[model samples]
Target: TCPFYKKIPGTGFTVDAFQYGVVEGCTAYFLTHFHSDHYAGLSKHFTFPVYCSEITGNLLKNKLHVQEQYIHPLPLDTECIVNGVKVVLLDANHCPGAVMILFYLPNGTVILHTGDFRADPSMERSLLADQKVHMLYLDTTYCSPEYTFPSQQEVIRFAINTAFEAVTLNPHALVVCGTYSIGKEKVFLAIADVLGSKVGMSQEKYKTLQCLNIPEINSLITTDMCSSLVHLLPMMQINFKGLQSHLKKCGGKYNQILAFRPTGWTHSNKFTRIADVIPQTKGNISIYGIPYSEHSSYLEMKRFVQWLKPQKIIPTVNVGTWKSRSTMEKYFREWKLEAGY
Candidate 1:
């Protein structure tokens, strides 16, 4: 069951009702973005209609590989009802498939929920324009005044440059850069867009990529038709000792090799497992480190909080601890807020 409105012990704002579990009689709910945190839980507890941008819907369908029975896909700027509340989907611009949700309740309360996002000038201006937002459920993941996050283009630039450097140094070895599977897909396309060819894809990925018009992807074959110029492989490839050894043995045949790496969770996860798979000075394998994060920076978080002043900002997906919400209240004290899920 969802909890009801209650004043946070420290922050003055009231907590919204508990959202997950078998809650009864709630009118509407909006999915701000399709990140694992937002929708992964839905398949477990509720199958009610969840509204999001079309891109989000597409991405969710691919990522979750779920049936249409679970998702209620909507288009950008289109108006719809969620539990009787009018909501609109806006381009969040975090990922190609991300979205920001705007809710208009029958009582005239307009709330904007900026699910994990950054302050891209183009995306921000567009969000503020053509819409009226009163209360905001901001994404304060990195919301500290002093924090800084590089833009997507900047991160991509760094990734490419790092790959170039790694390949130049190891000349004979193939290189893979660690990154998120879904999130790194765009980075892969950015490189492919420059190369003008399709790469390889898993049968499932092939279908999803085809929908996105990504034709060039590496096939899971011994010899790739896309050529060995640059390929984006899954993170688990690093753990296959046999595959790494084989690629090392064949490293001499391919020139200008590049691969995208990814981790399952934050740096605190099994990053060493991926690191262990990188051949060290022997088996014709070379790897480079490209630490790119998709979430907004600390400064962006603060600015977002200032812009979308929601009564209570609940940080879901995280452990059910009060730490994040409490920190939000502490950092944004001027606004008088509360946090928790």
Candidate 2:
């Protein structure tokens, strides 16, 4: 019920998915980033030509195993013609190779799709410079004021310091930093470099990171737990149950276990999810969920909308059920009103 996709009427182009309801006879499909929720229906069986950033194309080909013939990589800030529509890719600053997409339709309408991105002033200025947008497909993942947090770099700093503090307090402690499979490589890489150690990842994650071809990252990844005092793990694995289970399985190998999460949910108070709260330590583990999210906060989202003032805004991902247009409209209205934009 969470995955969402849309088709541009009369343009013969689709966004996000290849499924029946998402695209009806779409001539081509565009991907904003390589995140799983964004690419829900994508697979090796995908048939239409898919356009995305160069790094996204590499991930699709090497990790997801989508054929090279079907994937067309778009370079950042350059316009290219695909299926008769002029398209451009802008750096989204969400993850490595992530981009915000722009399309110029035959009818002279300009549409911008902000896949998933943090609101960086420079990137926002660069994207909106001298551009007229008829429609905006926004990433509303954190479209509420309660989701406000520090910049990603600042939060990454907090996480790095927190991990080091834990290990400093307990020399035999193992620090487990959590992140999405692809989004927060910076945090892990920082931990490795700052702590002077290699980072451990699951074999599957290691394979995926290899596609990035980053020299520093390649030298830092390892499957052996003992290779480093700090291990990079899936963010969800930092939870109480998961941590307890992992420690039990380790069988006294680690004297202490510390968990760190770099995410915006660290500041949330209204949400009820596992990681939806401020940073704190619990029991034997020192857990700190730092506010290091890629999506724009409500205030930032408001600034973006007020600056661009698109004729229409289409909310992407986790808005509501697939069948109702009103549901998305209602959700967007609340956000617009809440943000006063």
Candidate 3:
């Protein structure tokens, strides 16, 4: 349901790519992030030049093995030109290397493509400082009021301390941190920093982390699983019913396993099955879903819209769907008219 790409009127350039196989004519493509969904249909064989942040460009080159010539790395917050469109890259805050693209069209229309980001004070100021936005392409991942959750810092603090306590209580227990391929590195790094412990990961994951050159995280990586108190496994490895068998095989002398999945899905009723702190304990293994998300909450989205006052709001996901469109209208009415921002 996501609007993968938007073609600029009277211009050949496209923002992101359409599923148009063997396509041609676009001057350049803008990639918001390295997330699979946002980067759908993009690969090493992509013909048109792709522009993104330096970190994302490095990832596309190093991890995805997209040729260097096709990847154009732009510094965040700097103005650049692709074809006739004036563009600027901003930190998405969603993941490492994630970025939001601001397009200044020839017609003097300002369009913002917020790749995927959590709203913060700085971001609001940066966008509203100079110009009024005409069209806002928002990442409405959690557009419902039911998705209200605490800030990322608060949740990170909760997850770190909770893991620390769990490990301290069960001296022989192992801590398994669930994370995505390119996001939520902060949680694992924080856990390592506070506990003064090494985090274990596969050699490939460790290499990817090294390429990012985050000093705090470099020394904390270890390939020896048993040497570290915490093993940072990808979300694919820990989510679903696989946690049961995976932990069993990994659990050696350790008597207990504590798994933390930091996600916003924890706030929904569907996740009541595995509530926060109230772990769904199965024998020696306990699983907890922490409400930690990179996407802006419903309240944050409201604040962002109020600050920007865009003429048109276009949701990136659930396009043409009743739920997202109606929710956005409700938010606009509440924030723009009722609250009078």
Candidate whose TM-score is highest = 3
Question: In model 1, which range of ten residues has the least summed lDDT?
Answer: 5-14
Per-residue error (Å), model 2, residue 255: 0.7
> Pick by lDDT: which candidate is best?
3
- Predicted candidate 2: what Cα RMSD to the true structure? 4.2
Q: What's the lDDT for candidate 1? A: 0.51
Candidate 1 residue lDDT tens string, 197-308: 3444445545555444233343321135335445445555644463465455454565434455432223422334322334333234444433355666665565555554
Clashes of 2: 0
Query: Candidate 1: misplaced stretches above 4 Å?
Result: 1-22, 27-29, 41-47, 59-70, 81-83, 127-134, 144-147, 164-180, 193-197, 213-226, 239-243, 246-252, 255-284, 308-319, 334-341
Clashing pairs in 2: none
Q: lDDT ranking from best to worst?
A: 3, 2, 1
Cα lDDT tens digits for candidate 3, 1-341: 32334655556666656456544566777778777866777768876788888887877888778889888888877888877678888887788888888888888888888878887778866745799889888888878778777667777887788878877777787778886677888778788767778999888888788767576665788888878878887787665466666666675667777888876666453444222457778777787777777898878887887778888877776567777678767866777686554
Candidate 2 local lDDT, 1-341, one digit each (tens): 21334666557776776445345466788887888866877778887789888888989988878999999997788779887888889888788888888888888889888888876667656746867899898887776557666666666676677667767777778878887758777877887777788888788888888877577666788888766777877777888778877777667878677777766565353444333434556677667666667778777777777667688887875567554456546656775676566
List pairs with backbone clashes in candidate 3: none
Cα displacement (Å) at residue 272, model 3: 9.9
The per-model lDDT (C-alpha) reads 0.51, 0.75, 0.76
TM-score of each: 0.69, 0.84, 0.89
